[PDB]
Design a binder for these strands. Sequence first.
RNA 1: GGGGGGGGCAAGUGUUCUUCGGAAUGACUGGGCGUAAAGGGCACGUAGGCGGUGAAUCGGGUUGAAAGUGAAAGUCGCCAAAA
RNA 2: UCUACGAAGGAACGCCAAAAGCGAAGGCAGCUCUCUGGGUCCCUACCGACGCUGGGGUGCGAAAGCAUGGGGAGCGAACGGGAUUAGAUACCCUGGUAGUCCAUGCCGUAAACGAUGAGUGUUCGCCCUUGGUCUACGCAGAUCAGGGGCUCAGCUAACGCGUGAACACUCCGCCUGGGGAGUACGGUCGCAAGACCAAAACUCAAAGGAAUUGACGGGGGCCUGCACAAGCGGUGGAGCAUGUGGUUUAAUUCGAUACAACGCGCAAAACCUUACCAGCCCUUGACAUAUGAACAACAAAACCUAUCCUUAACGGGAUGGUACUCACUUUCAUACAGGUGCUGCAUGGCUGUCGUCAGCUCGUGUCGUGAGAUGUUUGGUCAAGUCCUAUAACGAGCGAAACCCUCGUCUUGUG
RNA 3: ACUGGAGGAAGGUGGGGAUGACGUCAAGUCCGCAUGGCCCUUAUGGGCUGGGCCACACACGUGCUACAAUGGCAAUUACAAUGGGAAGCAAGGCUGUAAGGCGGAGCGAAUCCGGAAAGAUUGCCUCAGUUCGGAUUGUUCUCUGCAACUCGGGAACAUGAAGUUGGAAUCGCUAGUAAUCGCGGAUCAGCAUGCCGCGGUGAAUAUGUACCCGGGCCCUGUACACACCGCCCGUCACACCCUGGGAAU
Length: 281
Amino acid sequence: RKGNPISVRLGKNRSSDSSWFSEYYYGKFVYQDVNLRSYFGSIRPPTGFRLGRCIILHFPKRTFIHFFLPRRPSLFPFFGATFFFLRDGVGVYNNLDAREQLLNQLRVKCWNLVLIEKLKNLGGIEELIKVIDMMIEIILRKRGIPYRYNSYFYEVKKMRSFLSNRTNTKTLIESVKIKSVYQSASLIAQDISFQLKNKRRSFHSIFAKIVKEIPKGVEGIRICFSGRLKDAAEKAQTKCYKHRKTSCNVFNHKIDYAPVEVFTRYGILGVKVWISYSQKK
RNA sequence: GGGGGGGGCAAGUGUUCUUCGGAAUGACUGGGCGUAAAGGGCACGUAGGCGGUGAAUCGGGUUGAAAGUGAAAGUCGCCAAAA
RNA sequence: UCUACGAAGGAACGCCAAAAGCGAAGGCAGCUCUCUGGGUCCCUACCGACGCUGGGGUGCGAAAGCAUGGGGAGCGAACGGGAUUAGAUACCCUGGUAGUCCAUGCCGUAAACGAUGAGUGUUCGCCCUUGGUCUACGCAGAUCAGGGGCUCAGCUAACGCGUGAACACUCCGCCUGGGGAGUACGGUCGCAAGACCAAAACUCAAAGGAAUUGACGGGGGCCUGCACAAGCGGUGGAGCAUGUGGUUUAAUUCGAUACAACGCGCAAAACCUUACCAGCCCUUGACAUAUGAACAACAAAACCUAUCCUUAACGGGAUGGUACUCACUUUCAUACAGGUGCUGCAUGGCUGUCGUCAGCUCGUGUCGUGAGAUGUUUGGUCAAGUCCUAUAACGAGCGAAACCCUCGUCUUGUG
RNA sequence: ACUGGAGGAAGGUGGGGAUGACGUCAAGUCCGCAUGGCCCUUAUGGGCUGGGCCACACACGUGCUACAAUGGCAAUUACAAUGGGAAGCAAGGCUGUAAGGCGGAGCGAAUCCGGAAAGAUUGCCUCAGUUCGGAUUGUUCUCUGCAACUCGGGAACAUGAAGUUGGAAUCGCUAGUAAUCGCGGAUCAGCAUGCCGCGGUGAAUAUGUACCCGGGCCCUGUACACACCGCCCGUCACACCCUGGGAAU
């Protein structure tokens, strides 16, 4: 009785997130999918600050990953000619330019050290060049302590290290700014599960913010709560709000649903969100 | 119930007793009695209450005026001293 | 029994007939006659304000009851049996006296109920209708007394009345929470039964009226489901397998409990699974962070591929070898880790459930002082609040349908 | 809208699934997971073996087997579908009465693997407690595992409980369904009378709302609102309290 809207719509509406196939490894691909969905959540979400849908793809030694982030509040066996053709186009910290600036002012910021140990050393050195390039390169790798490079989030490099090391495959991680924030359902759930965490907030104010900002062509929003409500602390009960088009017995209706559970030390409260998308726009 | 904190009053506070008000909750001012408590089983009739007109008279009630009295203290208005 | 005629009696009065009529009220009817109360109509004559109500008082006052004397058909308390039931003083049957009836007396009470004191004046109408009166010219129009509906307004907490429960009036009786209680005491009246005046102690925060929703009903009023009906086969009897109810120790682990638990978690108990029971031990623990007193290694130690030995097993004891980290997991010590420990009457999630039932509702509008009513209350259709029709609602959401897949027929395309 | 009729392979939701409102029942489970609160912190914690979860005077539930001759058995022959297979499915040959054993063509699987059972042909039976019926019930054995006395299947052969349609009741079903026929997975070394799926064969009956039953409507009545398994009256037994009559005073 009363299924959710996932198990019906995979036939027509939705494409399941991943896309691949195995015969012997399926048993170790369903897990490399589920645990990684567990990951991408609980990654500096304090507040919201960070969310996601994370459509993934697996190829034979290639793995595509595409997050979805809202706004912050010759010889042919040179196959490099088609690999970096596609594993490059980010622009996330195209360190070419800031590295260029560091290259420019590097001469000064090092040559001014290299004259109590500059001229004396030049005397002893041009008396006694590659081995001098050794007492030269000692200071290039001194700047582990002071360092002025940057990145919006090179955490992409960070994870393309972690997982490619522990899985042994060529990987690609991108993030795309989902502009119209939380038109999805997992996003809305992740959101209101933050305001319900400290400090406390109003249900009616949450729904007022919702009807304030979100109704931009979304067909309807049906939202339920549950838990030890405010505030008799006994007899946990339910309440739910509705809107124009709130249907699930009708097919061909992308209506995404993902509950969540956050607490108040008085037991736990849990919300559910059943949005409905205007189809055929 | 205990710790802390705060409100109300203040050389006074709180409980009980005591009487009025709220209490139109005995209703003259200020009610009800069909279904809510309350119209008698019904009438008769005694006092008793109350109850047509116009004309006349009297002046008991009625009413207008004066004095006596309605102790002083009290209530109250003012005034002044008193703190 | 019946069937025709008779006789005896008693008792009530069929139809008319009547929300009709008469009475002050209780009441009153087969008929005829004597006597007799009150009434209304009527030119109107007189008469003259003599009226209205009415404390204590006075009569009347159904039924049952009492007294004395009649009568006793039928009915029928009490009682008898047939019954009926777990039981039956009952309801059901058959008997059946007192009683019903008449004569006179006694009580003096009834839901004596329009549950509405009595009287006077003023009030929009319509419909009637009992009996009077005036006027009649196709026929009624008018006017009085009443009896009965329906209404304008007015009032009412609500229903409702409107011959008032309206607008006002005078008089009478009474009420002041429920219970205790119309009880005790007491005074009168009665042959008795009893009647009439009639409290309080004590006790509670309620007792209650009308109306709304909802449920309910061995009540109507439809309509429907292997529910029943037409069926066909099964558990219940025997033997086994499984599960639970039980009782048995050391355990017979635990949760499930009408449809909606019990071949259920279980999609799989040798040990393991396993919480349960005994031995066997461990306790910063198998596991996690920080924790530095530590120990020192710039490679020790540990630690681990393999050999040996003991432990019912865990281990453990070696014993090589491999193997290294300036971090040692390596050490004890800590803060702790942990608990299939308790709690679903704290919860989330999940599920069963009514039920694939067709019913749930919302927004404005109205109506209701209000709770709430309307939309979904009409005639039909549907498997459906599916639909049309009607409509003070107009609409929307949820639900249903169709969307989905599948099979079935066929079309094409890769083969 | 209904009734037919047409075509059509399908006629009026063609059949099946899927999909399951408000909400109700403090329904279920803190023993899956998560979680509040409360307790133990050499213990209710961790691990090891043993032993227990499998018993039994006992009732109840679900499933299986049949009492037969529409049949039990032996030899002949006919027809599936799903599916499953690398801790794997394994043809053939050889070996064992057989269960088992030796080894292996192919197959990670439209290609390799898999005697369908009913049914049908003949014969035996000839109506028995039986050649129907098989629990209990002996010896040999064997599969796994390190390990089969309490505590997994499997084969040989002998024994052969009750059972002759099973009370009252009560349950399941309206056409590929009932009933039976097997076949195939599932968890898993060892395993199904259980569960999930697949196909063989295959009807009874449609009187329809009279009835009991169940549900809805709406129309009435209610003292019910924990909503009839509701409220609720009265005697008696019980405690405390108050009060009346009452001889005599």
